[PDB]
Design a protein around this ligand. Sequence first.
Ligand SMILES: CC(=O)Nc1cccc(CO)c1
Ligand SMILES: [Mn+2]
Ligand SMILES: [Mn+2]
Lengths: 137, 137
Amino acid sequence: MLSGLNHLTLAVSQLAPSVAFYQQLLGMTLHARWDSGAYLSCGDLWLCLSLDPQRRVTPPEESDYTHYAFSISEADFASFAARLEAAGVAVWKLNRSEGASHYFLDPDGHKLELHVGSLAQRLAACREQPYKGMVFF
Amino acid sequence: MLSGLNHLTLAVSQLAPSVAFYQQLLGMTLHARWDSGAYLSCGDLWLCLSLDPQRRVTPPEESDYTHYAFSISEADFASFAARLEAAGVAVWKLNRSEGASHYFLDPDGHKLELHVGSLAQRLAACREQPYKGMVFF
Ligand SMILES: CC(=O)Nc1cccc(CO)c1
Ligand SMILES: [Mn+2]
Ligand SMILES: [Mn+2]
């Protein structure tokens, strides 16, 4: 059977600024870097940044809702979000439609999110404030 | 401080075939569905399918290398790949790197992968045979 996410690979247009974003700004751990990529971890997540000449810097109105959310604790959430804001990190969404979340963009316009809470906690919240037509299995 | 991947959200053009693909073909657990999305899990992975009229069914030549790899054991790899093949699921790349990998497309052209092997395994292989320009930290 499938047993989780083995890795997330993001295509990047400029490797050095992307490594700086994920390692310096977001605090992920850099394990290795080469001419065409980098390997980082964020807790158990294996993140690969892959230099791709096809990657375009994409404004958020031009891309669909596909996005990648990173876990953060309730105690750290607000100050991390505020630090990203003060650093000039672009955003893509304001309405909290799935709980406590901050929506921000990477240098290439990959849609990212800080989120507080597990799937179990989101299902429990949705039982009280369900999305239209929601059914639970 | 970020502690891991909280969730992966894929924009989908048609909810029913995407639910069938992830739940029935790929065996993920469906926890909830609503008029415009679904929540599934795959091991620790929280997957959200979000119905989005902006999602284009995208040929693999027209998207960049961004992709999502799921873990599977070596013992299960070949029969799962054969299941995808029987279902006519398209392949977007052949494997040329360490660890078994099967590169396949979802109904909207999201680039997926089955991979056997951890970051630690990849780093160990890279230390013995470093990529061009590779530096370790
Ligand atoms: C600061 C840093 O880690 N620089 C670096 C590492 C590996 C390769 C290259 C050149 O592609 C630069
Ligand atoms: Mn989200
Ligand atoms: Mn991969």
